[PDB]
């Protein structure tokens, strides 16, 4: 099946675009300690309405604008 | 059967008014195909009796095995100065592993095939004093009895 990836909005202002920061467990190589290595990706909301902490589903696809490859597939929940 | 050899052999300088005072002392090897303890000096005024009297005194006392079938079952560690000396098992189909001071005491202790190495500084005077700290650290069958009987 498909893959949808858990991000959290953390910067919404611009129209039809939400900035999401995705925190996954990255391990150090030599010292083997997990850490949060946050990585923004630029997700396109269908209509912007988000803000901050909104868990979402995104997925890999075709671009629609420059630095895109991501869509909103569903809002798990909101926290704005 | 008794096994003994020599290790060091040297002389000591002291002074008493203008003394150079050379007196021939030494370290020696003790074992018995089980290991023994003792390593004494013996002051002398010639190189032959420096090792002679050294062996008298290095015959004092014995210490027991912890090998089964020529090798130790368990990796074990001890310490004395920067002579830190570790061993771990060595399977059958190998010869006698390790050079340094831990070549000679690692034969005489009944062993002919066990792994060894020494981390840190090898200070010959006390690697000896770190090697016998493994005949207090043992996983010999009495310890198997000391969880199954005890």
């Amino acid at each position: 099946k498909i893959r949808t990836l858990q991000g959290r909005v953390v910067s919404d202002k611009m129209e039809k675009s939400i900035v999401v920061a995705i925190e996954r467990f990255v391990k150090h190589p030599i010292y083997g300690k997990f850490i949060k290595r946050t990585t923004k990706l630029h997700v396109h909301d269908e209509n912007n309405e988000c803000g901050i902490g909104d868990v979402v589903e995104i997925r890999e696809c075709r671009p629609l604008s420059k630095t895109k490859s991501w869509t909103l597939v569903r809002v798990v929940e909101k926290a704005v | 059967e008794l096994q003994e050899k020599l290790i060091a052999v040297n002389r000591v300088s002291k002074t008493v008014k203008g003394g150079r005072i050379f007196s021939f002392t030494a370290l020696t090897v003790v074992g018995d195909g089980n290991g023994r303890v003792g390593f004494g000096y013996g002051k002398a005024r010639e190189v032959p009796a420096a090792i002679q009297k050294a062996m008298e005194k290095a015959r004092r006392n014995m210490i027991n095995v912890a090998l089964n079938n020529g090798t130790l079952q368990h990796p074990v560690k001890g310490v004395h100065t920067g002579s830190r000396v570790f061993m771990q098992p060595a399977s059958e189909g190998t010869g006698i592993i390790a050079g340094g001071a831990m070549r000679a005491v690692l034969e005489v202790a009944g062993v002919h095939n066990v792994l060894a190495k020494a981390y840190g500084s090898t200070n010959p005077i006390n690697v000896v004093r770190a090697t016998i700290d493994g005949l207090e650290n043992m996983n010999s069958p009495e310890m198997v009895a000391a969880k199954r009987g005890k």
């Binding site: - | 059958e92 189909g93 190998t94 010869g95 006698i96 592993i97 390790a98 050079g99 070549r103 002919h112």
Partner: protein, 205 residues
């Protein structure tokens, strides 16, 4: 190098003969043996540790005629096998053609055994060789040729062959100048001057 020099002079400070011009002679026969080969470029004393430790390393090394490299390489196949490292080594060392021939009575001297294989008078199976090393194995057939049942050197080395027990792991035929290397060596009975534990310590770093 293949040497080409004064065999018996080595005996002196070897403290053993190890088959230097055997055929009529050995220690203190028409030669000065068991001395020191120097006037006082070298003379007897108490010996150093490290002396011994080098000498014995060469002991094992010299009675096959193997170079520097080779014998180490054999060690790198032994400590690649999961069997006995000590055994394996002396196993590989006896695979050399030159050693095998001597122990089929062909050559009265170790050097002579190896100086046979040189001149075209040797062969193994129907294959002709002139190579002093070969892969020698169970149920091979060591064969003399035509014009080597003709040489008067070969015959003259059967003398001494009647005077050496010859191994039990090979057939030996002198009557048609064959013999097979029918099965593996035993070293349950050649390790009698060889302490494997010594040399393998040194080889290790």
């Amino acid at each position: 190098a293949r040497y080409l020099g004064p065999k018996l002079k080595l005996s002196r400070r070897e403290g053993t003969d190890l088959f230097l011009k055997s055929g009529v002679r050995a220690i203190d026969t028409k030669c000065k043996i068991e001395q020191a080969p120097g006037q006082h470029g070298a003379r007897k004393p108490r010996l150093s540790d490290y002396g011994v430790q080098l000498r014995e390393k060469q002991k094992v090394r010299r009675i096959y005629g193997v170079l520097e490299r080779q014998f180490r390489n054999y060690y790198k196949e032994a400590a690649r096998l999961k069997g006995n490292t000590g055994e394996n080594l002396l196993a590989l060392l006896e695979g050399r053609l030159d050693n095998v021939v001597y122990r089929m009575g062909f050559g009265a001297t170790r050097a002579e055994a190896r100086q046979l294989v040189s001149h075209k008078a040797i062969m193994v199976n129907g294959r002709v060789v002139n190579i002093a090393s070969y892969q020698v194995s169970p149920n091979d057939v060591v064969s003399i040729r035509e014009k080597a049942k003709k040489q008067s050197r070969v015959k003259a080395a059967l003398e001494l062959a009647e005077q050496r027990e010859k191994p039990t792991w090979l057939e030996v035929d002198a009557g048609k100048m064959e013999g097979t290397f029918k099965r593996k060596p035993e070293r349950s009975d050649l390790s009698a001057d060889i302490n494997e534990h010594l040399i393998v310590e040194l080889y290790s770093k």
